[PDB]
Design a protein around this ligand. Structure first.
Ligand SMILES: CC(C)CN(C[C@@H](O)[C@H](Cc1ccccc1)NC(=O)O[C@H]1CO[C@H]2OCC[C@H]21)S(=O)(=O)c1ccc([C@H](O)CO)cc1
Lengths: 99, 99
């Protein structure tokens, strides 16, 4: 589809057997998701933006479906205020910016 | 242009007569630029990101050219980690997400 940017580009995702709403975010290298108790091993990470840094847990090779488009990659889990789909997954669903 | 997302969507912008590099950021409501001198009046404002809230200077109705496309809108100036072009200007240059 084509998503205009009058409003936040929120879409439904499926991850860890749960459906959630997330931003398609060209300004994020990586994908950051709200706190959720995913199984498996993880690595600590700190990530920074406006306001400073938050601590997250890095999970690798996580399956995630974005608007019916399947992807698999790294997801960072932590106290983010919003679910953020970053470029590591946006490339996998064929997403581009156009103007 | 059509911009793929294997790399950061960085573009050259012109504001206050000066060229800078900025990130096209669909996850940003607003445009936030690093500390700089800009002519005109401004108002103190607050903006929140992944890590909390920061104080910024709000410049309204500012001329800014983004990758060869003119926009006139609000620009926030403050301690952002990266110059980001948000939806308030992305809409003005006709930017959409497509997949
Ligand atoms: C360069 C950007 C600042 C990076 N960021 C993505 C932005 O899109 C961000 C996404 C967002 C965060 C919190 C609330 C709402 C949106 N937007 C945002 O700050 O926008 C400002 C401005 O306009 C206002 O609207 C929204 C909130 C206001 S990030 O999140 O800090 C981030 C940092 C490091 C990673 C590493 O890649 C991980 O490894 C991934 C993602």
């Amino acid at each position: 589809p084509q998503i205009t940017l009058w409003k936040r580009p929120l879409v439904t995702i499926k991850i860890g057997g749960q459906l959630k709403e997330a931003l398609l975010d060209t300004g994020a290298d990586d994908t950051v998701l709200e706190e959720m108790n995913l199984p498996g091993r993880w690595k600590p990470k700190m990530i920074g933006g406006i306001g400073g840094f938050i601590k997250v847990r890095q999970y690798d090779q996580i399956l995630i479906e974005i608007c019916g488009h399947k992807a698999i990659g790294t997801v960072l889990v932590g106290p983010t205020p919003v679910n953020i789909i970053g470029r590591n997954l946006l490339t996998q669903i064929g997403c581009t910016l156009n103007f």
